[PDB]
């Protein structure tokens, strides 16, 4: 009843309502001040940073009245890029490990906004029966989202997950058998040399040199096969080549 | 005066284009479903491809009139109901289904018209053809596909009427 | 389930309706039009269809939930309307979360931001 | 093949290198490996039965290997003459 007030007060109701944000954006709709509508429902979405399904909610409600307003066209496709740009950042949260979502017993709705940070390691920890390529090129993908404030270095966190990946490869242990080469192709890590060539990434120069890679300690954890480091050695270094 | 079982062989002697076009006028102005399947058969006897002759009928059905469509950016100015042309469009199909290869062709251009009763808003009509339509026709053309010894692309037309074909089936 | 169909209408497999998987390499201008104007035309009208539907069986939150699936850029809904189709959708909307609002209940969320 | 070869001419393939490796490393031996094709397919086809299709192909493989030899030889004398 408070908002069923007539036209000579909906200002005056719109100005009381400036403290029921959640609220006066309907009043602003109905008002036909599209403009307005949509700078509360950017504003809401902006502030909401949890609960997936309010999010997405808050996120389309912000671009439906981005075009309800009469904007010109340069704005309503800026205010679309950004928005668009946050299902971006969104699709990571919707391509979770569905069994791991379930048999932990959350929700994507009932558990708020986690880091890229927290994402990227859900993604890699072992406990993650997923062992696929998509998992890996995501998480790499997520880096993107990371932004100078640091919140974990970028580059040993990109080791940590290279390692990993050539974690799930197999081996002839103790002495191989076999080319490092053509023996890896069937290996996931391999798949992602090739995925990150054909999204445009370098090999040689985006790749640890093999310096950093004999620094790098999970990849120093296996080096009891003599034929795993080896492999590691020469498949980095013909693809680096392959590269340059 | 009418004697089909003669009517195949002077329009065999006219030139192919010509004696197929009045051949397909001919065959239009035949309704009875049993005296046209033995105009059909009289045709493949004499060599009269069946297949075009129910094309060029459909296609001329369909030119007779232009289209049907109603919007707001294509508003058209004349207004206009249904018509016994709407309803020839309509008994113009069985043609198609008569024969062994051409239900991927009468599911073509059922959605082709089908498209003009939407647009001018003639849901019943669609229905109506719609129900005309037989449930096999759809395996029929996979089945065709497959025996035609080749799976490779099936034509954008092709998948385009199967896609459009499944949709509207799930919103009637 | 009147419900159900009208939802696998709407989200069925290989995205969209009037949304085809494979483009015309025979370009047919026709074909074209008419696609994009019975997309333009009926989408609003069954949408408001399903909205009816949900307002009268009181899940208001589900007639919320179709602001989303139409922001779907899977399928694309925003384009084909225009603006008085997506205004009366909008107050559409606004009704629905109405009557969840009168129950005292933030229409943002299950719970109350404000 | 390599490995037969190497083998039948009694060289060493120990668990760090294989036999073509220590061939490849070892380029002073490379007129060693020819008598080891000819006598690795006379005891595998003695092996093979006669009606086995892959006891042709060996055949065949080996005489394509060594007349590709041969002429990457006499091509390369011919060319930087």
């Not at chain 1, 090739?194 to 040689?204: A, D, H, M, P, R």
């Not at chain 3, 039009?33 to 035309?41: E, G, W």
């Not at chain 3, 899977?74 to 084909?80: A, G, H, I, R, S």
């Not at chain 4, 073509?20 to 690795?40: G, H, N, P, T, W």
């Given at each position: 009843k408070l908002l069923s007030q007539p036209?000579?007060?909906?200002?005056?109701?719109?100005?009381?309502?400036?403290?029921?944000?959640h609220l006066?954006?309907?009043?602003?709709?109905?008002?036909?001040?599209?403009?307005?509508?949509?700078?509360?429902?950017?504003?809401?979405?902006?502030?909401?940073?949890?609960?997936?399904?309010?999010?997405?909610?808050?996120?389309?409600?912000?671009?439906?009245?981005?075009?309800?307003?009469?904007?010109?066209?340069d704005v309503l496709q800026e205010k679309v890029e950004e928005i668009a740009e946050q299902e971006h950042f969104l699709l990571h949260q919707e391509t979770l490990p569905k069994k791991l979502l379930e048999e932990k017993q959350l929700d994507l709705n009932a558990m708020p906004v986690l880091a890229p940070f927290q994402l990227i390691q859900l993604y890699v920890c072992e406990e993650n029966k997923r062992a696929n390529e998509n998992d890996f090129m995501k998480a790499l993908d997520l880096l993107e989202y990371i932004g100078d404030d640091s919140?974990?270095?970028?580059?040993?966190?990109?080791l940590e997950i290279l390692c990993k990946a050539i974690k799930?490869?197999?081996?002839?242990?103790?002495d191989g058998k076999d080319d490092p080469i053509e023996a890896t192709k069937d290996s996931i890590f391999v798949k992602v040399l090739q995925n990150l060539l054909n999204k445009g990434i370098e090999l040689k120069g985006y790749l640890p040199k093999a310096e950093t890679l004999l620094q790098s300690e999970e990849l120093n954890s296996l080096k009891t096969n003599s034929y795993f480091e080896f492999s590691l050695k020469a498949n980095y270094e013909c693809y680096m080549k392959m590269q340059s | 005066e009418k004697q089909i079982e003669l009517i195949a062989f002077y329009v065999s002697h006219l030139p192919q284009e010509l004696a197929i076009s009045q051949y397909a006028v001919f065959l239009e102005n035949?309704?009875?479903?049993?005296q046209r399947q033995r105009c059909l058969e009289l045709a493949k006897e004499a060599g009269l491809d069946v297949a075009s002759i129910t094309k060029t009928v459909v296609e001329n059905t369909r030119k007779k009139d232009a289209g049907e469509f109603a919007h707001h950016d294509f508003a058209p100015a004349l207004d206009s109901g249904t018509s016994e042309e709407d309803r020839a469009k309509i008994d113009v199909i069985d043609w198609l289904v008569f024969d062994?290869?051409?239900?991927?062709?009468?599911?073509?251009?059922?959605?082709?018209?089908?498209?003009?009763?939407?647009?001018?808003?003639?849901?019943?009509?669609?229905?109506?053809?719609?129900?005309?339509?037989?449930?096999?026709?759809?395996?029929?053309?996979?089945?065709?596909?497959?025996?035609?010894?080749?799976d490779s692309a099936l034509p954008a037309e092709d998948d385009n009427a199967i896609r459009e074909h499944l949709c509207i089936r799930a919103y009637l | 389930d009147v419900k159900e169909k009208i939802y696998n209408v709407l989200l069925f497999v290989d995205g969209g309706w009037m949304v085809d998987v494979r483009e015309d390499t025979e370009e047919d201008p026709e074909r074209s039009h008419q696609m994009v104007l019975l997309r333009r035309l009926c989408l609003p009208m069954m949408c408001f269809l399903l909205h009816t539907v949900l307002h009268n069986t009181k899940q208001y939150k589900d007639c919320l939930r179709l602001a989303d699936i139409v922001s779907s850029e899977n399928q694309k809904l925003y384009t084909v309307f225009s603006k008085t189709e997506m205004?009366?959708?909008?107050?559409?909307?606004?009704?629905?979360?109405?009557?969840?609002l009168d129950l005292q209940l933030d229409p943002l969320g299950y719970e109350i931001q404000s | 093949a390599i490995q037969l070869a190497l083998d039948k001419r009694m060289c060493t393939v120990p668990q760090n290198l294989t036999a073509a490796d220590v061939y490849f490393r070892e380029v002073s031996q490379m007129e060693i490996i020819?008598?080891?094709?000819?006598?690795?397919?006379?005891?595998?086809?003695?092996?093979?039965?006669?009606?086995?299709?892959?006891?042709?192909?060996?055949?065949?493989?080996?005489n394509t290997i060594l007349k590709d030899m041969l002429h990457v030889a006499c091509q390369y004398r011919q060319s930087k003459n």
């Amino acid at each position: 009843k408070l908002l069923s007030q007539p036209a000579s007060q909906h200002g005056q109701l719109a100005a009381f309502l400036q403290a029921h944000d959640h609220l006066s954006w309907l009043h602003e709709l109905n008002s036909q001040e599209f403009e307005k509508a949509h700078r509360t429902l950017q504003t809401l979405a902006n502030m909401e940073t949890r609960y997936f399904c309010k999010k997405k909610t808050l996120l389309g409600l912000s671009k439906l009245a981005a075009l309800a307003s009469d904007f010109q066209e340069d704005v309503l496709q800026e205010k679309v890029e950004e928005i668009a740009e946050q299902e971006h950042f969104l699709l990571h949260q919707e391509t979770l490990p569905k069994k791991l979502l379930e048999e932990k017993q959350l929700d994507l709705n009932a558990m708020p906004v986690l880091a890229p940070f927290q994402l990227i390691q859900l993604y890699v920890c072992e406990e993650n029966k997923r062992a696929n390529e998509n998992d890996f090129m995501k998480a790499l993908d997520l880096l993107e989202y990371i932004g100078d404030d640091s919140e974990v270095d970028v580059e040993e966190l990109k080791l940590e997950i290279l390692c990993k990946a050539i974690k799930r490869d197999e081996w002839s242990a103790t002495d191989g058998k076999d080319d490092p080469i053509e023996a890896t192709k069937d290996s996931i890590f391999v798949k992602v040399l090739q995925n990150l060539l054909n999204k445009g990434i370098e090999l040689k120069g985006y790749l640890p040199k093999a310096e950093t890679l004999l620094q790098s300690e999970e990849l120093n954890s296996l080096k009891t096969n003599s034929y795993f480091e080896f492999s590691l050695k020469a498949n980095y270094e013909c693809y680096m080549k392959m590269q340059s | 005066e009418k004697q089909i079982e003669l009517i195949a062989f002077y329009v065999s002697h006219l030139p192919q284009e010509l004696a197929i076009s009045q051949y397909a006028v001919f065959l239009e102005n035949i309704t009875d479903p049993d005296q046209r399947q033995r105009c059909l058969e009289l045709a493949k006897e004499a060599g009269l491809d069946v297949a075009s002759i129910t094309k060029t009928v459909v296609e001329n059905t369909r030119k007779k009139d232009a289209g049907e469509f109603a919007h707001h950016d294509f508003a058209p100015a004349l207004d206009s109901g249904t018509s016994e042309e709407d309803r020839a469009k309509i008994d113009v199909i069985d043609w198609l289904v008569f024969d062994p290869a051409q239900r991927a062709e009468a599911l073509k251009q059922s959605n082709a018209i089908m498209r003009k009763f939407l647009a001018s808003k003639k849901h019943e009509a669609a229905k109506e053809v719609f129900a005309k339509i037989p449930q096999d026709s759809i395996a029929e053309i996979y089945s065709q596909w497959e025996e035609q010894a080749m799976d490779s692309a099936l034509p954008a037309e092709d998948d385009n009427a199967i896609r459009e074909h499944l949709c509207i089936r799930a919103y009637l | 389930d009147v419900k159900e169909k009208i939802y696998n209408v709407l989200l069925f497999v290989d995205g969209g309706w009037m949304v085809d998987v494979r483009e015309d390499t025979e370009e047919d201008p026709e074909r074209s039009h008419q696609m994009v104007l019975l997309r333009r035309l009926c989408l609003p009208m069954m949408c408001f269809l399903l909205h009816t539907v949900l307002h009268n069986t009181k899940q208001y939150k589900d007639c919320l939930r179709l602001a989303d699936i139409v922001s779907s850029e899977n399928q694309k809904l925003y384009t084909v309307f225009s603006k008085t189709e997506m205004r009366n959708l909008l107050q559409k909307l606004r009704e629905s979360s109405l009557m969840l609002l009168d129950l005292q209940l933030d229409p943002l969320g299950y719970e109350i931001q404000s | 093949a390599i490995q037969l070869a190497l083998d039948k001419r009694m060289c060493t393939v120990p668990q760090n290198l294989t036999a073509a490796d220590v061939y490849f490393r070892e380029v002073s031996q490379m007129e060693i490996i020819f008598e080891c094709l000819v006598d690795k397919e006379e005891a595998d086809l003695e092996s093979t039965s006669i009606d086995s299709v892959e006891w042709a192909n060996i055949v065949v493989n080996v005489n394509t290997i060594l007349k590709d030899m041969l002429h990457v030889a006499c091509q390369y004398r011919q060319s930087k003459n």
